[PDB]
Coordinates of C-alpha atoms and ligand atoms in Angstrom, one line a residue:
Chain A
X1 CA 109.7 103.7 14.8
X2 CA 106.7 102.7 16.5
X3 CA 107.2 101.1 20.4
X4 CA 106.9 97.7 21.9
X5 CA 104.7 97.8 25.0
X6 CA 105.2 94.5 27.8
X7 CA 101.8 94.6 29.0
X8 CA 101.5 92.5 31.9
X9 CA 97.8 90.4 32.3
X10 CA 95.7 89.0 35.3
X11 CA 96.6 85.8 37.4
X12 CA 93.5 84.6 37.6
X13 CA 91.2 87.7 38.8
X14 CA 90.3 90.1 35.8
X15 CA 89.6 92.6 38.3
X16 CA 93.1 92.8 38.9
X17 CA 94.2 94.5 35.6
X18 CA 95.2 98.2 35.5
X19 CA 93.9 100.9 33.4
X20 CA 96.6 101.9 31.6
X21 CA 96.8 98.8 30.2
X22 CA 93.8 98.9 29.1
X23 CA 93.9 102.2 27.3
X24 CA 97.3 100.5 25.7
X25 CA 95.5 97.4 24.6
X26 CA 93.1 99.5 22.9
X27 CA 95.5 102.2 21.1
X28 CA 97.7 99.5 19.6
X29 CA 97.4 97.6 16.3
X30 CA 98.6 94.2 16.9
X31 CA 99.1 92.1 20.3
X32 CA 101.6 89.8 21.0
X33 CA 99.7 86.9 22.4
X34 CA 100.9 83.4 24.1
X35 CA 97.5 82.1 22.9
X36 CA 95.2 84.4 20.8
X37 CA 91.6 82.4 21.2
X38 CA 93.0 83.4 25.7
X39 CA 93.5 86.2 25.0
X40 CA 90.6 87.0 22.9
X41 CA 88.2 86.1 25.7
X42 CA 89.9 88.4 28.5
X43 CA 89.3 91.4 25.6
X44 CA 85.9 90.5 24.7
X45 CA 85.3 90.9 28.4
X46 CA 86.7 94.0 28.6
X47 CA 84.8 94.9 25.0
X48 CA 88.5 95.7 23.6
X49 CA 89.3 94.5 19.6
X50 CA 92.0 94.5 18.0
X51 CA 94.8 92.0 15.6
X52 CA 96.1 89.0 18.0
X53 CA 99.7 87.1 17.1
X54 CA 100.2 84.0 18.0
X55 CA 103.4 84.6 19.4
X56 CA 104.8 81.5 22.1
X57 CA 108.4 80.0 22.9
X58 CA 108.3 77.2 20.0
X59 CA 107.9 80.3 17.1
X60 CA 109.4 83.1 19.6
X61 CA 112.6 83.4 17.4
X62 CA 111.0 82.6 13.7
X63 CA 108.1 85.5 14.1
X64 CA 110.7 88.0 15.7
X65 CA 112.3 89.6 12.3
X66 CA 108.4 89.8 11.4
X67 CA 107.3 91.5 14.5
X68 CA 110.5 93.6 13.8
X69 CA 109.8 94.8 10.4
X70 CA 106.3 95.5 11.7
X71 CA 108.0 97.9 14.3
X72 CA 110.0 99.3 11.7
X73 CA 107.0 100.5 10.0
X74 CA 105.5 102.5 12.4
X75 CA 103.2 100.2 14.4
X76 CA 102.6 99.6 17.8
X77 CA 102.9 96.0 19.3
X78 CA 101.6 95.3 22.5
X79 CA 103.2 91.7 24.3
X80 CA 100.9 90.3 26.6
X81 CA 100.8 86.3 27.9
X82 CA 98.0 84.0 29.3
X83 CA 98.7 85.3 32.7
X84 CA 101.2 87.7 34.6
X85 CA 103.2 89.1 33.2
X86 CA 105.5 88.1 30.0
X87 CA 109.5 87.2 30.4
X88 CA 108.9 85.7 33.4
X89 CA 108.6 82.0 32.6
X90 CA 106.9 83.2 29.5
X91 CA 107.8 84.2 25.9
X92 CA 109.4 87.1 24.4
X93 CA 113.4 87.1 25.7
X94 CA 114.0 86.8 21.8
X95 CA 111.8 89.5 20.6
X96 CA 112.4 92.2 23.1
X97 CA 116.6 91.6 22.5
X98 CA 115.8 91.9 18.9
X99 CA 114.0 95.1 19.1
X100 CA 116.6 96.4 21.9
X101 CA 119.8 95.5 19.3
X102 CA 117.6 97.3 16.9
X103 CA 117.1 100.6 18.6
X104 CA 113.2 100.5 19.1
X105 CA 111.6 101.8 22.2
X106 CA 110.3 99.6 25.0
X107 CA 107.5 100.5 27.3
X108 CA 107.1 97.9 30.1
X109 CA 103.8 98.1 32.3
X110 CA 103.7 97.4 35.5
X111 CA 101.1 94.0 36.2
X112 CA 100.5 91.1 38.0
X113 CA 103.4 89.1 38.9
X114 CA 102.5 85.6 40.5
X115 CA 106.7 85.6 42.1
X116 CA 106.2 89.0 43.7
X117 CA 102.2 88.2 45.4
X118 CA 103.6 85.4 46.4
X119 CA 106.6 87.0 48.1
X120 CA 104.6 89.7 49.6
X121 CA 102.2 87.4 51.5
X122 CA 104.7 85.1 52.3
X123 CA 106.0 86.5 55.6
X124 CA 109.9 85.9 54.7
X125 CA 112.7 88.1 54.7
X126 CA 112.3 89.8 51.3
X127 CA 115.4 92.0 50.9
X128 CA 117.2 89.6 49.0
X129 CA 115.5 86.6 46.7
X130 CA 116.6 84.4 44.2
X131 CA 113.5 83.0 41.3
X132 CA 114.8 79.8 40.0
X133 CA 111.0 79.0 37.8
X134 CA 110.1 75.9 37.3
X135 CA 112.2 73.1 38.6
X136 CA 113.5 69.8 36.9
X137 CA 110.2 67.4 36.3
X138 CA 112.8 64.5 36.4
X139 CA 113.8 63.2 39.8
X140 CA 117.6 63.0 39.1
X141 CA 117.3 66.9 37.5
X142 CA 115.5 68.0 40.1
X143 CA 117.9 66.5 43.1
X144 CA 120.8 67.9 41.5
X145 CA 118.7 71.5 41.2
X146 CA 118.5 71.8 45.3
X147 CA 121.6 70.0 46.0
X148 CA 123.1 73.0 44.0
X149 CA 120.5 75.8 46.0
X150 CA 121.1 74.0 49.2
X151 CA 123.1 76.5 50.6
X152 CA 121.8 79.3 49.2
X153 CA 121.1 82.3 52.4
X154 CA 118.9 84.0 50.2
X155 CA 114.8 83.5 50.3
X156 CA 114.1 81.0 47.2
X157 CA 111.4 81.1 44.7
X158 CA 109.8 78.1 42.7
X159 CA 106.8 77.3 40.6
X160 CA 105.2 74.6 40.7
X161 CA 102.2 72.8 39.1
X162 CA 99.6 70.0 40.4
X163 CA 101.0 67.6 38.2
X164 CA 104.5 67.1 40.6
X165 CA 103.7 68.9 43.9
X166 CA 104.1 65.9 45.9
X167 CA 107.2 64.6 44.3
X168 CA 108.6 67.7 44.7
X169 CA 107.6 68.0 48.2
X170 CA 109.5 64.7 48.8
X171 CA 112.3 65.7 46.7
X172 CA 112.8 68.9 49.4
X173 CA 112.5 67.1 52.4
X174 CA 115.0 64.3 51.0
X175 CA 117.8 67.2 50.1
X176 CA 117.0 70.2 52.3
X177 CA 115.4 68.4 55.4
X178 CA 111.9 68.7 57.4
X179 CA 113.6 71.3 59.3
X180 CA 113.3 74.5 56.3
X181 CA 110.3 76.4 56.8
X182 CA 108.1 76.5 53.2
X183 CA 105.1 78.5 52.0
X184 CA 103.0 77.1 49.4
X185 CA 100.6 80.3 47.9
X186 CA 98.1 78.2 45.9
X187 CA 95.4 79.8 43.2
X188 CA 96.4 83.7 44.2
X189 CA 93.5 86.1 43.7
X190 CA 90.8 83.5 43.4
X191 CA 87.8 81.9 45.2
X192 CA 90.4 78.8 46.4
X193 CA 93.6 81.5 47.6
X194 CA 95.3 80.1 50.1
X195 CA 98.4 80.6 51.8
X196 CA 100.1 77.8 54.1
X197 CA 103.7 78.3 55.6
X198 CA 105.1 75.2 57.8
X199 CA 108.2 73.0 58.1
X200 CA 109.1 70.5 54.5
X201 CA 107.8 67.4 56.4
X202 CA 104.7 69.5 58.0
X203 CA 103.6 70.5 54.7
X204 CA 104.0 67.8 52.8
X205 CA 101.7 65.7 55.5
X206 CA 99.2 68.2 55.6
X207 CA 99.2 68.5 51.4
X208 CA 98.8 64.6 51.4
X209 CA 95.8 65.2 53.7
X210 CA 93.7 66.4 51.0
X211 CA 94.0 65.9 47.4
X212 CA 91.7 69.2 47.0
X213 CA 94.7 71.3 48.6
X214 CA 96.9 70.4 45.5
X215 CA 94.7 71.8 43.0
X216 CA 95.6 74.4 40.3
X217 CA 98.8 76.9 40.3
X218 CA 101.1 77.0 42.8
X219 CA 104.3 78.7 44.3
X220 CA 106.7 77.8 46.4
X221 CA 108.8 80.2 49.1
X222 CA 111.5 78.7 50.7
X223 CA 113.5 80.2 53.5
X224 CA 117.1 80.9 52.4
X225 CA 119.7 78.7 54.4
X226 CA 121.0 79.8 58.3
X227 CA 124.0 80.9 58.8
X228 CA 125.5 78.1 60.9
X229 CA 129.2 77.5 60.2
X230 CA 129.6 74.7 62.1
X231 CA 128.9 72.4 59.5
X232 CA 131.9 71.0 57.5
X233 CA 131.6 71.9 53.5
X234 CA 129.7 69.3 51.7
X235 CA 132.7 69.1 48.6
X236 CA 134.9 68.4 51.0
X237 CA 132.6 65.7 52.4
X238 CA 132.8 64.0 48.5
X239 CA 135.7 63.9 47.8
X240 CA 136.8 62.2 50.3
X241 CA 133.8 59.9 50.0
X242 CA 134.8 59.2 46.4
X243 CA 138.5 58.7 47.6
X244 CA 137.9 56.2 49.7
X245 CA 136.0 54.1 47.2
X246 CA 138.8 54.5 44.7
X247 CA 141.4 54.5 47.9
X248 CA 142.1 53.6 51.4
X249 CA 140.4 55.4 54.1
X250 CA 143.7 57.5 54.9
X251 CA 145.2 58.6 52.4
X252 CA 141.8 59.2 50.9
X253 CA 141.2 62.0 53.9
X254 CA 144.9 62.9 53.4
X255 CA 144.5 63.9 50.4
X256 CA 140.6 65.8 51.0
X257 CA 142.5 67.9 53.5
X258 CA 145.6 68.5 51.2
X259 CA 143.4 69.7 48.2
X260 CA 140.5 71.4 50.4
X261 CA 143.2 73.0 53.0
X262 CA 140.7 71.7 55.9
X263 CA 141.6 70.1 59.0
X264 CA 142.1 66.2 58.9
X265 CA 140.7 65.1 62.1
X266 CA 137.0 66.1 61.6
X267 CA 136.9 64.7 58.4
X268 CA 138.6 61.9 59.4
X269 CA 136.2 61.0 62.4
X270 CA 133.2 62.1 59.9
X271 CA 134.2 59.2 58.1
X272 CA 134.4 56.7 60.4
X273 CA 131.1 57.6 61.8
X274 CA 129.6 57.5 57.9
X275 CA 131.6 53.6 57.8
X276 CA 130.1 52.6 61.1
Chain B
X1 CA 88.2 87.0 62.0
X2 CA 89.4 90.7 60.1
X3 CA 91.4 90.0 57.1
X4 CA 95.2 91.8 56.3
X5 CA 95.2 93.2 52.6
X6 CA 98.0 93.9 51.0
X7 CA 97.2 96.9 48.3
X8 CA 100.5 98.0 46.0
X9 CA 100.6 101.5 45.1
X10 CA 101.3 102.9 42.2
X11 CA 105.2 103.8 41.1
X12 CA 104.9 107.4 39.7
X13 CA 101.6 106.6 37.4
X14 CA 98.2 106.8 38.8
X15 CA 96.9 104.8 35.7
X16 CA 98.6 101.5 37.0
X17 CA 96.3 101.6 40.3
X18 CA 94.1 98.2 39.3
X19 CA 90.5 98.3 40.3
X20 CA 91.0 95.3 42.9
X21 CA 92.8 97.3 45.3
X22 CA 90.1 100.4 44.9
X23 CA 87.3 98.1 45.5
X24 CA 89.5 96.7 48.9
X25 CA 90.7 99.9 49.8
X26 CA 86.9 101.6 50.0
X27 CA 85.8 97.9 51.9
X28 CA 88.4 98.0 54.5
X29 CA 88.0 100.5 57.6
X30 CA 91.4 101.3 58.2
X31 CA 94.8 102.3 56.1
X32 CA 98.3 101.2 57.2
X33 CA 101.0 103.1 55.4
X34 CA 104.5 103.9 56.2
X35 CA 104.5 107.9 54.5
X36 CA 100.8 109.0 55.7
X37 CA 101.3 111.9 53.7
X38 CA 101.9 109.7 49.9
X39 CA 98.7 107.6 50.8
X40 CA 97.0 110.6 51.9
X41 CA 97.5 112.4 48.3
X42 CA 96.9 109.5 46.6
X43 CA 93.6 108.6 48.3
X44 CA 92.9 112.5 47.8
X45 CA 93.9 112.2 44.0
X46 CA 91.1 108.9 43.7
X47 CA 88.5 110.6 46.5
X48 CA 88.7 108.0 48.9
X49 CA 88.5 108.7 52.7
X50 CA 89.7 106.4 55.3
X51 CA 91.3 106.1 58.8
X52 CA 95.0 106.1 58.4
X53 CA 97.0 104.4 60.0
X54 CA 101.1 105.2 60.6
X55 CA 103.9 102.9 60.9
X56 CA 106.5 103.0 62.9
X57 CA 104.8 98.0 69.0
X58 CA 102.4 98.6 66.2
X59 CA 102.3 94.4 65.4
X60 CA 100.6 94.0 69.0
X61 CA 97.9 97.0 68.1
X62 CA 97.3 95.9 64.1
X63 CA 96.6 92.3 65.8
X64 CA 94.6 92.8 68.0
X65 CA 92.8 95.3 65.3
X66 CA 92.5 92.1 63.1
X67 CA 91.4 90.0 66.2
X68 CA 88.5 92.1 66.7
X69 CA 87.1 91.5 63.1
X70 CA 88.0 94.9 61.4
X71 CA 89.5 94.5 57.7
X72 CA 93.5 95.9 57.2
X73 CA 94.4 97.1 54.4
X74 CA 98.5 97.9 54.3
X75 CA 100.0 99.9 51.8
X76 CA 103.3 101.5 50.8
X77 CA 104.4 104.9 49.2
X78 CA 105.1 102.9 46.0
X79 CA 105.5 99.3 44.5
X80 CA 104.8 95.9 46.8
X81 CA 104.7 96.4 50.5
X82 CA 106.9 94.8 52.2
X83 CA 109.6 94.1 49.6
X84 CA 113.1 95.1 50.8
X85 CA 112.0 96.3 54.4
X86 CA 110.8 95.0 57.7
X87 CA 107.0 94.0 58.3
X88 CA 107.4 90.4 56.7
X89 CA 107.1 89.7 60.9
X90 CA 103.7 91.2 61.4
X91 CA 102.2 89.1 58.5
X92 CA 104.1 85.7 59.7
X93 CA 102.6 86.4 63.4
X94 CA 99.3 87.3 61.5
X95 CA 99.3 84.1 59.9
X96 CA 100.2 82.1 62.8
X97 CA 97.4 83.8 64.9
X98 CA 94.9 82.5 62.5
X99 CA 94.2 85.7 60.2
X100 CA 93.8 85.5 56.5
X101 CA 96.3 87.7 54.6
X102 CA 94.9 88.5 50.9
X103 CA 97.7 89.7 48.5
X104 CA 96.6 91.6 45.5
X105 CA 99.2 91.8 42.2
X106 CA 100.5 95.4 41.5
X107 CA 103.2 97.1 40.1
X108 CA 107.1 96.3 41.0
X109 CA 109.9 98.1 39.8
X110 CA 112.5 95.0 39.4
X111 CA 110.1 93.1 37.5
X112 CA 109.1 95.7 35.5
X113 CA 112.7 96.8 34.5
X114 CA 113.7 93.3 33.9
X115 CA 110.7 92.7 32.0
X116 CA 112.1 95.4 29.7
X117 CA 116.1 95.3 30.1
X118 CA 116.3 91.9 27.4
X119 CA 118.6 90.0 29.0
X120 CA 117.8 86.9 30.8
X121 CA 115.4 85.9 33.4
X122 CA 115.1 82.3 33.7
X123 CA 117.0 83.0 37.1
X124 CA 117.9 86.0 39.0
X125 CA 118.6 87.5 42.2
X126 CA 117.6 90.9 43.5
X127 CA 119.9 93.0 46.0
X128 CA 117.8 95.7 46.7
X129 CA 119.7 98.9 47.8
X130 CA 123.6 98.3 47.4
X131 CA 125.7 100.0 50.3
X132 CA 125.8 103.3 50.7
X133 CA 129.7 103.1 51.6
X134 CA 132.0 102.6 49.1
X135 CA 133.7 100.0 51.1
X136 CA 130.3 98.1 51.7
X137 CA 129.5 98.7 48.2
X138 CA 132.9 97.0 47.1
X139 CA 132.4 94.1 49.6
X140 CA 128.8 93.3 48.4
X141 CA 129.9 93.3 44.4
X142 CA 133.2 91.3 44.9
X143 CA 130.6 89.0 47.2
X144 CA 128.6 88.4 44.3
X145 CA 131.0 88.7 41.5
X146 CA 131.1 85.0 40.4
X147 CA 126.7 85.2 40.5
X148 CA 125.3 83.8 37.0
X149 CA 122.1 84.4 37.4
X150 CA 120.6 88.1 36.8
X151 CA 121.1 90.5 39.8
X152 CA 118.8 93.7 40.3
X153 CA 119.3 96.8 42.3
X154 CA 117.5 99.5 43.7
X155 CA 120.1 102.6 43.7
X156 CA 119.5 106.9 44.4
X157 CA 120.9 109.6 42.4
X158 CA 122.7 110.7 44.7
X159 CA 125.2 107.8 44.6
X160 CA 124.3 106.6 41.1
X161 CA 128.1 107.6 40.3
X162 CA 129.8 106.2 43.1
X163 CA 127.5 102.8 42.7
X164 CA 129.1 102.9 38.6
X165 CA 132.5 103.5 40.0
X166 CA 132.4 100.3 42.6
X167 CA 131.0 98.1 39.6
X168 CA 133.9 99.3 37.4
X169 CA 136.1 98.8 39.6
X170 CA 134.6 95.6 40.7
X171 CA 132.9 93.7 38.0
X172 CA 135.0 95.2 35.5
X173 CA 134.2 96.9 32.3
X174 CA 133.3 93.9 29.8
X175 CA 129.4 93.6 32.0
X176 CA 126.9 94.1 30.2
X177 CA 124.4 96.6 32.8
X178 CA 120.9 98.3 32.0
X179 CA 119.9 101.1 33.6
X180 CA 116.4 101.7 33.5
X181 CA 115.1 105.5 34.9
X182 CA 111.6 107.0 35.6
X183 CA 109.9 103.7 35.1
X184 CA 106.0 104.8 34.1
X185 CA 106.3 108.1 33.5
X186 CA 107.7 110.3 30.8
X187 CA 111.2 110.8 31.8
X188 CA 111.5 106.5 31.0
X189 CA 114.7 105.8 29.7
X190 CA 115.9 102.3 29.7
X191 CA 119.7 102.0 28.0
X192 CA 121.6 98.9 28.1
X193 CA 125.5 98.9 27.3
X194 CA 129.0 98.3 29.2
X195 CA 129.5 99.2 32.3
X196 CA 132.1 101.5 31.3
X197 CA 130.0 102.6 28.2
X198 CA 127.1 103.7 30.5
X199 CA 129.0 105.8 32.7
X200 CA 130.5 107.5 30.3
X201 CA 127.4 107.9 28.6
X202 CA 125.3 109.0 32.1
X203 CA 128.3 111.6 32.8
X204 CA 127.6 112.8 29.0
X205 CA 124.6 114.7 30.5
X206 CA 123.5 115.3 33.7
X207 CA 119.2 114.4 33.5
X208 CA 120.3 111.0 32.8
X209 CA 121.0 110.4 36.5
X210 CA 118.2 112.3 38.0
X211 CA 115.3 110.6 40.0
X212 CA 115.6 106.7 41.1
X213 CA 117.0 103.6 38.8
X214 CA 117.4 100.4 38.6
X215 CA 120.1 98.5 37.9
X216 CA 120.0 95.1 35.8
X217 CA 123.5 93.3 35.1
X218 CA 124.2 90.0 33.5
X219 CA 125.7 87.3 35.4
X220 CA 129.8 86.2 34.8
X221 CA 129.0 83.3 32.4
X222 CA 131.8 83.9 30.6
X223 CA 135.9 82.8 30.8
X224 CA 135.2 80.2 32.4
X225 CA 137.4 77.6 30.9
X226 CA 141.4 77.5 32.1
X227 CA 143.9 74.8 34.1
X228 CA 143.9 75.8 37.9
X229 CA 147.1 75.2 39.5
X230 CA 145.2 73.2 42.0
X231 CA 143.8 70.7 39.5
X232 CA 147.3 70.3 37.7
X233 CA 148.9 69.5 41.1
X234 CA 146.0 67.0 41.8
X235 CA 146.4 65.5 39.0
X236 CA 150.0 65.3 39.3
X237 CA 149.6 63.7 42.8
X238 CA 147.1 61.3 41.6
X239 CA 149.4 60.3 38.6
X240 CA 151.6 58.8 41.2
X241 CA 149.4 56.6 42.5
X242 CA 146.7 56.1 40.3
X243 CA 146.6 55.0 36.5
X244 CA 146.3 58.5 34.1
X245 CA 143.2 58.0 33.3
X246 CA 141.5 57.2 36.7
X247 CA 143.3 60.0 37.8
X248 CA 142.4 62.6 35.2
X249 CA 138.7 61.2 35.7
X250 CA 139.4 62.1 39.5
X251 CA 140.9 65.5 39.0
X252 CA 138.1 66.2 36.5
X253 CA 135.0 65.5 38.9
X254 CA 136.9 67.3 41.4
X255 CA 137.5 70.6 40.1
X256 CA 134.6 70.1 37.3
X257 CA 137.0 70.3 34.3
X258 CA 137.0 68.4 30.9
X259 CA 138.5 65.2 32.2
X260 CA 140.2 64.9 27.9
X261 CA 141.9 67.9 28.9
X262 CA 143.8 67.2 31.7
X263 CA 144.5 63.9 30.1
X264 CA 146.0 66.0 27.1
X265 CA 147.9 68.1 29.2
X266 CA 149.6 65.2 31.4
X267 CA 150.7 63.6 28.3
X268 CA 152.2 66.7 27.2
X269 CA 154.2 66.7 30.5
X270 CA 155.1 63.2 30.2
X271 CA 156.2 63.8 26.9
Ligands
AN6_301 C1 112.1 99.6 48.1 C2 111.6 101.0 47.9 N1 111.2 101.3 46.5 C3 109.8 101.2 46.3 C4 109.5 100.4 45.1 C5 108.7 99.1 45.4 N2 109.3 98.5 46.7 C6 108.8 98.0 44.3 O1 109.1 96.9 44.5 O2 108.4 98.5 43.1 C7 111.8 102.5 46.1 C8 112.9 102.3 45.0 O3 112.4 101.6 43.9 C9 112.8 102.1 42.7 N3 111.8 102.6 42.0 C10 110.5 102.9 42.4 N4 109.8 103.4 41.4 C11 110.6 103.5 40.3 C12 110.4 103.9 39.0 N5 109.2 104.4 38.6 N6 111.4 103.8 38.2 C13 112.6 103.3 38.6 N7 112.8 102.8 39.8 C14 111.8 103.0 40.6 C15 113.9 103.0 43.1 O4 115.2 102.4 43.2 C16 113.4 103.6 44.4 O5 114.5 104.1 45.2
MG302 MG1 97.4 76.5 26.4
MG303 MG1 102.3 81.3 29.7

């Protein structure tokens, strides 16, 4: 009976917190937290007490049916995360489908989103965007992640910690080139906020410059791909490069153009000039 | 030596203005908004007086305004400025002039639906405002009909039935869509079902398709497993020449099948 509130939480600057949220925090009886003792401090700061549950991704699902029987009985449960704002990289996918399949009402609250500051300062095309999160900490993982985005037109956005910025960094030059343009939006909406856009290469060089520029939170813009047909597609460009390891040269790119339906000749002269 | 702010407005709640962006707004000397007349209630609504400023070139004027050392605030009748509409070039040229651009968080509508909606968000795309032909409208679904990831879309009353029709026709009826209405206020209705289901279900009444919505659907991750013609012909041609199993191994990383499979199925043919 009673409603689930998603109540979005500040990025890093408490002054950035909105006064309807407050006034929810305050008339609910339990809050939904990622970490309670976090939590606790940003509402003794605001002089706000009330119940915290320790609610994160590793018991999302097992305290769901209890946060749904708490529903059920009339109270109100407020979600709220360490920062920004929750289901974005954060818990509570499980619970809000569980209260949705169970007819309760959900209020979202519009909050801080670290994504969308990023996006607005970023001076890129913003129509259309893509968030992919967080990307593969391994090297092979993360290759295969921006091979697969390579060609993606739309504006991209990452996240990204201190721990693998500069492998990262390398990572995008290797598979997307120093050509793309990039914009790294570090520690939004504190004393250390900056914003730097440049080319892959430029901005890895100038993050290697300093180790105090690869401090704290980060996110990463990338501009979505051109649209340049000239190039040949890059399946194409596999499959005849695996053919001609398991086969001869021509009826390796025979058989690319038969099953890709693209001309022979270019692919044919592409490689020759990949064998010389 | 000025400094760009960029100040979200609220979406239809005056609560969900955060103190931040009062505190800038009163500190900068001049307001750049798009709808002078929004910003003007709202500032009005909050007692604040400043110098307006109207949108409309104006990138020369607001540099040279920041240039001079006087502090910018820009604004938007609701939401993020400069999400889903032209200005992203003043702010790049800002940046490459040397000026300081200070975002502050504040309310967005696609978040905040899909924040609410349930389904996923590990990855998605927003769309913004679909076509308003029905032609465009077609062309831009079947363009991303084969999308996995989450997509979110800005859409007006007015066409709220043709946009359902195009989907229907498009995406089928099977997609799972939540339409989420009056976000912040107390006409809020989110309601997630088919696509079919929700229209019949909007048409039901006719205040469920008044004001502006959003429009989450889930990605095709579904049906994804058959035998293309093209990787039974590959295979075939690759039986030829190749042993079965290189070949079905070859056919398989092509065409990103189950390589077992088409191993299964050229045995069958054999046999
Ligand atoms: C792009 C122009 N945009 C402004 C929102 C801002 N740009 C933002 O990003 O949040 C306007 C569009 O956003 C949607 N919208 C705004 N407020 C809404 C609300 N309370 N409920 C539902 N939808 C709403 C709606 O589709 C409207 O036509
Ligand atoms: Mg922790
Ligand atoms: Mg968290």
């Amino acid at each position: 009976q009673g409603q689930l509130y998603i109540v979005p939480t500040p990025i890093g600057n408490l002054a950035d917190i909105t006064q309807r949220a407050l006034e929810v925090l305050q008339a609910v009886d339990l809050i939904a937290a990622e970490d309670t003792r976090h939590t606790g401090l940003l509402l003794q700061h605001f002089g706000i007490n009330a119940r915290l549950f320790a609610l994160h991704d590793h018991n999302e699902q097992q305290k769901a049916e209890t946060l749904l029987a708490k529903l059920q009985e009339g109270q109100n449960i407020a979600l709220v995360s360490d920062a920004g704002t929750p289901l974005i990289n954060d818990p509570g996918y499980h619970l809000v489908r569980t209260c949705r399949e169970a007819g309760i009402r959900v209020v979202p609250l519009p909050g801080p989103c670290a994504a969308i500051t990023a996006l607005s300062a970023a001076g890129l095309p913003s129509d259309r965007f893509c968030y992919e999160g967080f990307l593969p900490a391994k090297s092979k993982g993360r290759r295969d992640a921006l091979k697969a985005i390579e060609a993606e037109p739309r504006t991209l956005i990452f996240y990204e910690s201190t721990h693998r910025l500069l492998d990262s960094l390398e990572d995008i030059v290797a598979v997307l080139g120093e050509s793309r343009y990039v914009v790294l939006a570090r520690e939004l909406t504190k004393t250390w906020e900056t914003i730097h856009g440049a080319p892959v290469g430029e901005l890895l060089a100038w993050v290697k410059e300093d180790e105090n520029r690869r401090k704290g939170e980060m996110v990463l813009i990338v501009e979505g791909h051109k649209a340049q047909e000239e190039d040949l597609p890059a399946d194409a460009l596999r499959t005849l490069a695996l053919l001609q390891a398991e086969l001869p040269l021509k009826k390796a790119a025979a058989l690319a153009a038969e099953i890709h339906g693209v001309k022979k000749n270019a692919l044919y002269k592409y490689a020759l000039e990949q064998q010389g």
